[PDB]
Protein backbone atom coordinates (compact mmCIF):
# COMPACT_ATOMS: atom_id res chain seq x y z
CA UNK A 1 0.00 0.00 0.00
CA UNK A 2 0.95 3.60 -0.75
CA UNK A 3 2.91 6.25 1.12
CA UNK A 4 1.22 9.65 1.35
CA UNK A 5 3.36 12.40 -0.21
CA UNK A 6 3.56 15.23 2.33
CA UNK A 7 6.13 17.38 0.54
CA UNK A 8 6.42 19.84 -2.35
CA UNK A 9 9.27 20.47 -4.77
CA UNK B 1 13.05 -15.56 -4.30
CA UNK B 2 13.68 -11.79 -4.62
CA UNK B 3 10.67 -9.47 -5.14
CA UNK B 4 9.73 -5.84 -5.58
CA UNK B 5 6.86 -3.41 -5.22
CA UNK B 6 6.74 -0.13 -7.09
CA UNK B 7 4.28 2.74 -7.48
CA UNK B 8 4.68 4.76 -10.67
CA UNK B 9 3.13 8.21 -11.11
CA UNK B 10 2.93 10.56 -14.12
CA UNK B 11 1.38 14.07 -14.34
CA UNK B 12 1.29 15.86 -17.71
CA UNK B 13 0.19 19.48 -17.82
CA UNK B 14 -2.04 20.61 -20.70
CA UNK B 15 -2.48 24.38 -20.55
CA UNK B 16 -5.84 25.57 -21.84
CA UNK B 17 -7.22 22.04 -21.48
CA UNK B 18 -7.97 21.86 -17.78
CA UNK B 19 -5.89 20.28 -14.96
CA UNK B 20 -2.91 17.97 -15.59
CA UNK B 21 -3.65 14.37 -16.48
CA UNK B 22 -2.49 12.13 -13.59
CA UNK B 23 -2.02 8.33 -13.85
CA UNK B 24 -0.46 6.03 -11.28
CA UNK B 25 -0.12 2.25 -11.29
CA UNK B 26 1.36 -0.14 -8.73
CA UNK B 27 3.26 -3.34 -9.42
CA UNK B 28 4.44 -6.32 -7.45
CA UNK B 29 7.29 -7.83 -9.48
CA UNK B 30 5.99 -7.76 -13.09
CA UNK B 31 2.33 -7.88 -12.06
CA UNK B 32 0.16 -4.78 -12.31
CA UNK B 33 -2.21 -4.72 -9.35
CA UNK B 34 -3.72 -1.17 -8.87
CA UNK B 35 -4.37 1.84 -11.09
CA UNK B 36 -5.74 5.35 -10.82
CA UNK B 37 -6.49 7.67 -13.77
CA UNK B 38 -7.65 11.24 -13.07
CA UNK B 39 -9.56 11.42 -16.27
CA UNK B 40 -11.92 8.61 -15.26
CA UNK B 41 -15.48 9.77 -14.50
CA UNK B 42 -15.52 9.52 -10.69
CA UNK B 43 -11.94 8.36 -10.22
CA UNK B 44 -11.06 5.72 -7.64
CA UNK B 45 -8.07 3.45 -7.38
CA UNK B 46 -9.16 0.14 -8.89
CA UNK B 47 -7.84 -3.41 -8.51
CA UNK B 48 -6.04 -5.07 -11.43
CA UNK B 49 -5.08 -8.50 -9.90
CA UNK B 50 -7.44 -10.90 -8.12
CA UNK B 51 -5.41 -11.13 -4.91
CA UNK B 52 -5.81 -7.40 -4.12
CA UNK B 53 -9.59 -7.57 -4.49
CA UNK B 54 -10.07 -8.88 -0.95
CA UNK B 55 -8.79 -5.63 0.60
CA UNK B 56 -11.69 -3.94 2.36
CA UNK B 57 -13.38 -0.66 1.56
CA UNK B 58 -11.15 1.22 4.02
CA UNK B 59 -8.14 0.19 1.94
CA UNK B 60 -9.55 1.54 -1.29
CA UNK B 61 -10.75 4.73 0.42
CA UNK B 62 -7.25 5.49 1.77
CA UNK B 63 -5.55 4.59 -1.55
CA UNK B 64 -7.94 6.84 -3.47
CA UNK B 65 -7.27 9.67 -1.02
CA UNK B 66 -3.53 9.28 -1.57
CA UNK B 67 -3.93 9.20 -5.35
CA UNK B 68 -6.00 12.39 -5.35
CA UNK B 69 -3.59 14.17 -2.98
CA UNK B 70 -0.60 13.21 -5.13
CA UNK B 71 -2.39 14.55 -8.20
CA UNK B 72 -2.98 17.85 -6.40
CA UNK B 73 0.63 17.98 -5.13
CA UNK B 74 1.89 17.43 -8.71
CA UNK B 75 -0.35 20.23 -9.99
CA UNK B 76 1.29 22.71 -7.58
CA UNK B 77 4.75 21.22 -8.22
CA UNK B 78 4.42 21.59 -11.98
CA UNK B 79 3.74 25.32 -11.37
CA UNK B 80 6.80 25.48 -9.12
CA UNK B 81 9.01 23.88 -11.75
CA UNK B 82 7.95 26.54 -14.28
CA UNK B 83 9.44 29.10 -11.85
CA UNK B 84 12.58 27.10 -11.17
CA UNK B 85 13.41 26.72 -14.90
CA UNK B 86 12.14 30.18 -15.92
CA UNK B 87 9.67 28.51 -18.28
CA UNK B 88 6.52 29.82 -19.93
CA UNK B 89 3.07 28.73 -18.89
CA UNK B 90 2.29 27.88 -22.52
CA UNK B 91 3.82 24.38 -22.85
CA UNK B 92 3.02 20.87 -21.69
CA UNK B 93 5.42 19.47 -19.09
CA UNK B 94 5.80 16.08 -17.29
CA UNK B 95 6.45 15.15 -13.65
CA UNK B 96 7.17 11.47 -12.89
CA UNK B 97 7.73 9.77 -9.51
CA UNK B 98 8.58 6.13 -8.68
CA UNK B 99 9.05 4.65 -5.20
CA UNK B 100 9.05 1.20 -3.66
CA UNK B 101 11.16 -1.51 -2.08
CA UNK B 102 12.95 -4.74 -2.89
CA UNK B 103 12.92 -7.69 -0.51
CA UNK B 104 15.06 -10.81 -0.43
CA UNK B 105 13.89 -14.42 -0.06
CA UNK B 106 13.75 -14.05 3.71
CA UNK B 107 11.48 -11.07 3.17
CA UNK B 108 14.12 -8.58 4.43
CA UNK B 109 14.49 -5.13 2.87
CA UNK B 110 17.19 -5.20 0.19
CA UNK B 111 16.82 -1.66 -1.19
CA UNK B 112 14.32 1.21 -1.09
CA UNK B 113 13.67 3.73 -3.86
CA UNK B 114 12.14 7.18 -4.29
CA UNK B 115 13.00 9.30 -7.31
CA UNK B 116 11.47 12.15 -9.30
CA UNK B 117 11.97 13.32 -12.92
CA UNK B 118 10.86 16.46 -14.79
CA UNK B 119 10.33 16.37 -18.54
CA UNK B 120 11.90 12.99 -18.83
CA UNK B 121 15.20 13.79 -16.97
CA UNK B 122 16.41 13.03 -13.42
CA UNK B 123 15.41 15.75 -10.95
CA UNK B 124 16.00 14.45 -7.40
CA UNK B 125 16.49 10.94 -6.00
CA UNK B 126 16.78 9.50 -2.54
CA UNK B 127 20.09 7.71 -2.27
CA UNK B 128 20.26 4.02 -1.37
CA UNK B 129 21.21 5.05 2.19
CA UNK B 130 17.60 6.36 2.51
CA UNK B 131 19.11 9.35 4.19
CA UNK B 132 20.73 11.64 1.61
CA UNK B 133 19.72 13.01 -1.81
CA UNK B 134 21.11 13.34 -5.31
CA UNK B 135 19.86 16.55 -6.99
CA UNK B 136 20.45 16.72 -10.73
CA UNK B 137 20.80 20.50 -11.12
CA UNK B 138 20.61 23.79 -9.27
CA UNK B 139 16.80 23.76 -9.39
CA UNK B 140 16.60 20.37 -7.69
CA UNK B 141 19.10 21.72 -5.16
CA UNK B 142 16.33 24.07 -4.01
CA UNK B 143 14.05 21.13 -3.44
CA UNK B 144 16.91 19.30 -1.72
CA UNK B 145 17.33 22.18 0.73
CA UNK B 146 13.61 22.18 1.45
CA UNK B 147 13.56 18.42 1.90
CA UNK B 148 16.58 18.45 4.22
CA UNK B 149 15.01 21.10 6.44
CA UNK B 150 11.82 19.07 6.53
CA UNK B 151 13.53 15.69 7.20
CA UNK B 152 11.79 14.07 4.24
CA UNK B 153 14.41 11.34 3.96
CA UNK B 154 13.71 10.16 7.50
CA UNK B 155 9.97 9.95 6.72
CA UNK B 156 10.59 7.99 3.53
CA UNK B 157 13.08 5.70 5.27
CA UNK B 158 10.47 4.83 7.90
CA UNK B 159 7.94 3.92 5.21
CA UNK B 160 10.37 2.00 3.00
CA UNK B 161 11.76 -0.10 5.87
CA UNK B 162 8.38 -0.65 7.47
CA UNK B 163 5.06 -0.51 5.63
CA UNK B 164 6.55 -0.97 2.18
CA UNK B 165 8.13 -4.35 3.15
CA UNK B 166 5.23 -5.42 5.38
CA UNK B 167 2.62 -4.87 2.71
CA UNK B 168 4.72 -6.40 -0.06
CA UNK B 169 5.04 -9.55 2.08
CA UNK B 170 1.32 -9.58 2.54
CA UNK B 171 0.68 -9.22 -1.20
CA UNK B 172 3.17 -12.04 -1.83
CA UNK B 173 1.33 -14.37 0.53
CA UNK B 174 -2.10 -13.37 -0.73
CA UNK B 175 -1.15 -13.76 -4.39
CA UNK B 176 1.21 -16.66 -3.91
CA UNK B 177 -0.69 -18.71 -6.55
CA UNK B 178 0.58 -16.32 -9.24
CA UNK B 179 3.20 -14.06 -7.67
CA UNK B 180 5.32 -16.96 -6.47
CA UNK B 181 4.85 -19.06 -9.65
CA UNK B 182 7.35 -18.86 -12.50
CA UNK B 183 5.95 -19.82 -15.93
CA UNK B 184 8.83 -21.10 -18.10
CA UNK B 185 9.06 -19.93 -21.71
CA UNK B 186 7.66 -22.09 -24.46
CA UNK B 187 10.44 -22.11 -27.04
CA UNK B 188 11.05 -22.93 -30.70
CA UNK B 189 13.33 -21.91 -33.55
CA UNK B 190 12.05 -20.68 -36.86
CA UNK B 191 14.02 -20.53 -40.13
CA UNK B 192 13.36 -17.86 -42.78
CA UNK B 193 15.37 -17.53 -46.05
CA UNK B 194 16.40 -14.02 -47.04
CA UNK B 195 18.12 -14.98 -50.33
CA UNK B 196 19.61 -18.10 -51.87
CA UNK B 197 22.62 -17.57 -49.59
CA UNK B 198 21.41 -16.84 -46.07
CA UNK B 199 18.43 -17.31 -43.78
CA UNK B 200 17.23 -15.92 -40.46
CA UNK B 201 17.20 -18.24 -37.46
CA UNK B 202 14.80 -16.83 -34.88
CA UNK B 203 14.71 -18.22 -31.36
CA UNK B 204 11.32 -17.67 -29.66
CA UNK B 205 10.34 -17.56 -25.98
CA UNK B 206 6.59 -17.22 -25.29
CA UNK B 207 4.26 -17.32 -22.33
CA UNK B 208 6.83 -16.69 -19.67
CA UNK B 209 6.64 -14.95 -16.26
CA UNK B 210 8.50 -13.00 -14.72
CA UNK B 211 9.86 -10.91 -17.63
CA UNK B 212 13.56 -11.51 -16.85
CA UNK B 213 15.06 -13.87 -19.41
CA UNK B 214 18.30 -14.42 -21.35
CA UNK B 215 18.36 -15.52 -25.01
CA UNK B 216 21.72 -15.96 -26.72
CA UNK B 217 22.78 -17.50 -30.03
CA UNK B 218 26.05 -19.41 -30.27
CA UNK B 219 27.94 -20.63 -33.31
CA UNK B 220 30.18 -23.62 -32.57
CA UNK B 221 29.84 -22.70 -28.92
CA UNK B 222 30.85 -19.03 -29.33
CA UNK B 223 28.45 -16.20 -28.40
CA UNK B 224 27.19 -14.20 -31.41
CA UNK B 225 26.40 -11.01 -29.50
CA UNK B 226 27.36 -8.48 -32.15
CA UNK B 227 25.55 -10.53 -34.83
CA UNK B 228 22.34 -11.04 -32.79
CA UNK B 229 19.10 -9.07 -33.22
CA UNK B 230 17.27 -9.11 -29.91
CA UNK B 231 13.82 -7.45 -29.52
CA UNK B 232 12.76 -5.80 -26.30
CA UNK B 233 10.85 -8.19 -24.07
CA UNK B 234 7.16 -7.46 -24.68
CA UNK B 235 3.83 -8.14 -22.95
CA UNK B 236 1.52 -10.81 -24.25
CA UNK B 237 -1.49 -9.15 -22.56
CA UNK B 238 -2.34 -12.11 -20.27
CA UNK B 239 0.31 -11.50 -17.56
CA UNK B 240 3.05 -13.28 -19.59
CA UNK B 241 5.84 -11.98 -21.81
CA UNK B 242 7.47 -12.77 -25.16
CA UNK B 243 10.92 -12.26 -26.61
CA UNK B 244 12.95 -13.41 -29.54
CA UNK B 245 16.53 -13.26 -30.78
CA UNK B 246 17.62 -13.69 -34.40
CA UNK B 247 20.85 -14.22 -36.35
CA UNK B 248 21.51 -14.32 -40.07
CA UNK B 249 23.37 -17.49 -40.94
CA UNK B 250 24.81 -18.84 -44.22
CA UNK B 251 22.43 -21.31 -45.83
CA UNK B 252 23.64 -24.82 -45.01
CA UNK B 253 25.38 -23.94 -41.70
CA UNK B 254 22.21 -23.87 -39.59
CA UNK B 255 23.34 -26.80 -37.45
CA UNK B 256 26.31 -24.84 -36.08
CA UNK B 257 23.95 -22.46 -34.28
CA UNK B 258 22.45 -23.08 -30.89
CA UNK B 259 20.00 -20.89 -29.00
CA UNK B 260 20.43 -20.75 -25.22
CA UNK B 261 17.50 -19.91 -22.92
CA UNK B 262 17.87 -19.03 -19.22
CA UNK B 263 14.71 -18.39 -17.22
CA UNK B 264 13.74 -18.70 -13.57
CA UNK B 265 10.97 -21.09 -14.57
CA UNK B 266 13.42 -23.48 -16.16
CA UNK B 267 14.75 -26.58 -14.43
CA UNK B 268 18.00 -26.02 -16.29
CA UNK B 269 18.94 -23.70 -19.17
CA UNK B 270 17.71 -24.91 -22.57
CA UNK B 271 19.70 -25.44 -25.77
CA UNK B 272 17.73 -25.39 -29.03
CA UNK B 273 18.62 -25.79 -32.67
CA UNK B 274 16.59 -25.38 -35.83
CA UNK B 275 14.74 -28.64 -36.54
CA UNK B 276 13.64 -28.96 -40.25
Amino acid sequence: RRKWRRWHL
Amino acid sequence: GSHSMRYFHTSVSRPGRGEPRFITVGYVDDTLFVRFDSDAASPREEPRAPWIEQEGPEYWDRETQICKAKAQTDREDLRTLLRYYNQSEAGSHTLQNMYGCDVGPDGRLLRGYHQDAYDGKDYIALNEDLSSWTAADTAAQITQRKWEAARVAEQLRAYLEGECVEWLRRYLENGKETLQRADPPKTHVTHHPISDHEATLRCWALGFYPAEITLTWQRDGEDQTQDTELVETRPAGDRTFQKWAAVVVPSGEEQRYTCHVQHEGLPKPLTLRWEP
Binding site: - | F8, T10, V12, I23, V25, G120, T190, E232, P235
Partner: protein
Protein backbone atom coordinates in the same frame (compact mmCIF):
# COMPACT_ATOMS: atom_id res chain seq x y z
CA UNK C 1 13.67 18.46 -22.82
CA UNK C 2 14.91 15.71 -25.11
CA UNK C 3 12.34 13.73 -27.08
CA UNK C 4 12.60 10.00 -27.71
CA UNK C 5 10.78 8.39 -30.61
CA UNK C 6 8.70 5.27 -29.94
CA UNK C 7 9.81 1.74 -30.52
CA UNK C 8 7.00 -0.27 -32.08
CA UNK C 9 6.16 -3.96 -32.13
CA UNK C 10 3.03 -5.53 -33.63
CA UNK C 11 2.27 -9.17 -32.79
CA UNK C 12 -0.38 -11.59 -31.59
CA UNK C 13 -0.89 -12.87 -28.05
CA UNK C 14 -0.81 -16.50 -29.25
CA UNK C 15 0.59 -18.10 -32.41
CA UNK C 16 -1.68 -17.08 -35.25
CA UNK C 17 -3.96 -19.91 -36.45
CA UNK C 18 -6.37 -18.90 -39.23
CA UNK C 19 -9.93 -18.84 -38.00
CA UNK C 20 -9.25 -18.96 -34.26
CA UNK C 21 -9.85 -15.90 -32.10
CA UNK C 22 -6.72 -14.24 -30.76
CA UNK C 23 -5.47 -10.81 -29.76
CA UNK C 24 -3.58 -8.29 -31.85
CA UNK C 25 -1.07 -6.23 -29.84
CA UNK C 26 0.81 -3.03 -30.62
CA UNK C 27 3.48 -2.36 -27.97
CA UNK C 28 4.95 1.16 -28.04
CA UNK C 29 7.88 1.84 -25.74
CA UNK C 30 10.85 4.04 -25.06
CA UNK C 31 9.22 7.34 -25.92
CA UNK C 32 9.04 10.83 -24.54
CA UNK C 33 6.86 12.90 -24.16
CA UNK C 34 3.87 10.71 -23.34
CA UNK C 35 1.36 12.07 -25.84
CA UNK C 36 0.96 9.42 -28.54
CA UNK C 37 -1.71 8.18 -30.97
CA UNK C 38 -1.92 4.47 -31.77
CA UNK C 39 -4.39 2.91 -34.23
CA UNK C 40 -4.78 -0.76 -35.07
CA UNK C 41 -5.64 -1.36 -38.71
CA UNK C 42 -7.48 -4.14 -40.52
CA UNK C 43 -6.90 -4.02 -44.28
CA UNK C 44 -5.97 -0.38 -43.84
CA UNK C 45 -9.05 0.72 -41.86
CA UNK C 46 -9.01 1.80 -38.21
CA UNK C 47 -10.34 -0.84 -35.84
CA UNK C 48 -12.96 0.54 -33.44
CA UNK C 49 -12.97 -0.10 -29.69
CA UNK C 50 -9.20 -0.85 -29.31
CA UNK C 51 -8.11 -1.02 -25.65
CA UNK C 52 -4.89 0.11 -24.03
CA UNK C 53 -2.88 -0.30 -20.83
CA UNK C 54 -2.41 2.55 -18.34
CA UNK C 55 0.59 4.81 -18.98
CA UNK C 56 3.71 3.62 -17.15
CA UNK C 57 7.43 3.97 -17.59
CA UNK C 58 10.78 2.21 -17.52
CA UNK C 59 13.76 2.85 -15.28
CA UNK C 60 15.10 5.45 -17.71
CA UNK C 61 11.74 7.37 -17.41
CA UNK C 62 10.68 6.63 -21.03
CA UNK C 63 7.03 5.60 -21.43
CA UNK C 64 5.43 2.40 -22.65
CA UNK C 65 1.88 1.40 -23.63
CA UNK C 66 0.09 -1.73 -24.91
CA UNK C 67 -2.77 -1.32 -27.39
CA UNK C 68 -4.80 -4.46 -28.08
CA UNK C 69 -7.90 -5.92 -29.69
CA UNK C 70 -9.53 -9.31 -30.14
CA UNK C 71 -9.23 -10.48 -33.72
CA UNK C 72 -9.58 -13.64 -35.79
CA UNK C 73 -6.72 -13.87 -38.30
CA UNK C 74 -7.40 -15.12 -41.81
CA UNK C 75 -5.11 -15.92 -44.72
CA UNK C 76 -6.47 -12.81 -46.45
CA UNK C 77 -6.63 -10.09 -43.86
CA UNK C 78 -3.79 -7.64 -43.30
CA UNK C 79 -3.25 -5.90 -39.97
CA UNK C 80 -0.96 -3.03 -39.01
CA UNK C 81 -0.25 -0.49 -36.29
CA UNK C 82 -0.18 3.26 -37.02
CA UNK C 83 1.72 5.41 -34.52
CA UNK C 84 2.00 9.18 -34.40
CA UNK C 85 4.26 11.09 -32.02
CA UNK C 86 5.85 14.51 -31.91
CA UNK C 87 9.13 12.90 -33.01
CA UNK C 88 7.54 11.73 -36.29
CA UNK C 89 7.20 13.89 -39.42
CA UNK C 90 4.46 11.49 -40.47
CA UNK C 91 2.72 8.59 -38.75
CA UNK C 92 4.61 5.32 -38.85
CA UNK C 93 2.90 2.14 -40.01
CA UNK C 94 4.25 -1.24 -38.93
CA UNK C 95 2.56 -4.23 -40.48
CA UNK C 96 1.72 -7.34 -38.51
CA UNK C 97 3.94 -10.19 -39.62
CA UNK C 98 3.02 -13.63 -38.26
CA UNK C 99 6.76 -14.44 -38.13
CA UNK C 100 7.74 -11.54 -35.81
Amino acid sequence: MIQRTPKIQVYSRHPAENGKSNFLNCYVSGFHPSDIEVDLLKNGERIEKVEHSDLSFSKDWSFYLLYYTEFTPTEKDEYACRVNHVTLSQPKIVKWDRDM
